[PDB]
Amino acid sequence: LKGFKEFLARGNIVDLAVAVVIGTAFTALVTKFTDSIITPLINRIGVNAQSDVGILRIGIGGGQTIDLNVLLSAAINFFLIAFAVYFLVVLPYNT
Amino acid sequence: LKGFKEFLARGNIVDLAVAVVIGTAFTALVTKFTDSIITPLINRIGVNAQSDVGILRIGIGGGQTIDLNVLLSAAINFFLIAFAVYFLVVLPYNT
Amino acid sequence: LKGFKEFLARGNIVDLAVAVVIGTAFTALVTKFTDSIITPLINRIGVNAQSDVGILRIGIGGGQTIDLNVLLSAAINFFLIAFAVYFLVVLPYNT
Amino acid sequence: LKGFKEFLARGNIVDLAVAVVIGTAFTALVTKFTDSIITPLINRIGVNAQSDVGILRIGIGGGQTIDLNVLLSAAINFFLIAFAVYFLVVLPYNT
Amino acid sequence: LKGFKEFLARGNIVDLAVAVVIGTAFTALVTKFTDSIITPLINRIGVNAQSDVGILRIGIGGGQTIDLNVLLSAAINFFLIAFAVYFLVVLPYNT
Secondary structure, three states, X not given: OHXXXXXXXXXXXXXXXXXXXXXXXXXXHOHHHHHHHHHHHOOOOOOOOEEEOOOEOOOEOOOEEEOOHHHXXXXXXXXXXXXXXXXXXXXXXXX | OHHHHHHXXXXXXXXXXXXXXXXXXXXXXXXXXXXXXXXXXXXXXXOOOOEEOOOOOOOOOOOEEOOOOOOHHHHHHHHOHHHHHHXXXXXXXXX | OHHHHOOXXXXXXXXXXXXXXXXXXXXXXXXXXXXXXXXXXXXXXXXXXXXXXXXXXXXXXXXXEOOOOOHHHHHHHHHHHHXXXXXXXXXXXXX | OHHHHOOOOOOOHHHHHHHHHHHHHHHHHHHHHHHHXXXXXXXXXXXXXXXXXXXXXXXOOOOOOOOXXXXXXXXXXXXXXXXXXXXXXXXXXXX | OHHHHHHOXXXXXXXXXXXXXXXXXHXXXXXXXXXXXXXXXXXXXXXXXXXXXXXXXXXXXXXXXXXXXXXXXXXXXHHHHHHHHHHHHHXXXXX
């Protein structure tokens, strides 16, 4: 048990490994928040995806989509991350 | 060996590259748990996702889901990462 | 709320853990900017991927694709991340 | 070329970015080893996840699987990243 | 306007968050080159999916797979992450 446990507490490895444990975790509470709740409110939009033809010589030549409104949800991803975390850092810490 | 091994041991490229190797590995364990186990208990819930009528100008007109309960399985994703790391990594360090 | 929200703010666990909240959340606005808008414009290219005849022991032995231009949309992926990170973040900081 | 190739050698960007270039790169060799070689021996466990009768008010009424295979595979996702980083990076460094 | 683009620039976040921007985007370009130029050549090899038998008592029991050269589709990006970075980022820096 010595090799793994006692090397843990040193230096910046505990400041960081658990910190990218916070970067991926919280931004999933809040991204999967965007894209499950809101991106369907952004999938009711639909006006996008003006038809496109790409004739692949391997035979995919019916049509394609140039679909824009998930870019609209890509800001719903970033902003509400940057809203769910912007509230919690400013209130107890930034002051 | 010289170009790689010698410039292996330096600086933060270990405390910081290996530390985003603890981030993914521990949060590819516990997140892959959250949806292996809990989300289909939350997907047993199901009563979510009242339909969302989005008529694409490309021609998909059946229907869409404003699909909630994987959001509920994202709080399950942020919370239960923050407890499995609160005991293995925090209880023998913070104490 | 005490042991949690006040161990919140000490050291590099705020600067680093949310900089990867900014690592994933910022690029997702601009990566998905390049994949909903551009990669479909790069699906109009379509030329690349002359077939590959490759069998498996399961048995898939019809045809493969040796497909390039998403390499040519992965490059559009790295570049505009660099442009969008250079404008809102670096242009007010490099000054 | 001066704004790019002289702001790079400053501070910790080289030690920190190339690091998360190491972080994701290395576990991309190890987590996929987990899930390509082993996770499908873990789907050879087979008997997991007795059907989960979940009533959706919206249209799915046949069954739900809650597969513990991929949790036990996530245990193969965190244990096996630990060995690959301990042998190539730590044995000549911890010594 | 102010509190955003002026608290933006302080400390290491314009390093760190843009440095993990470097960790997200660079590995993605080299890995999709690895996934699009190369997967074809690698799915021509067919080392993957050696037939296996895993009895789901929940009803997938026809034939299974144990993917071996998806391990071989992964080594190609980890090393090429370590090869594409060495020419663009390292050779004018290590000098």
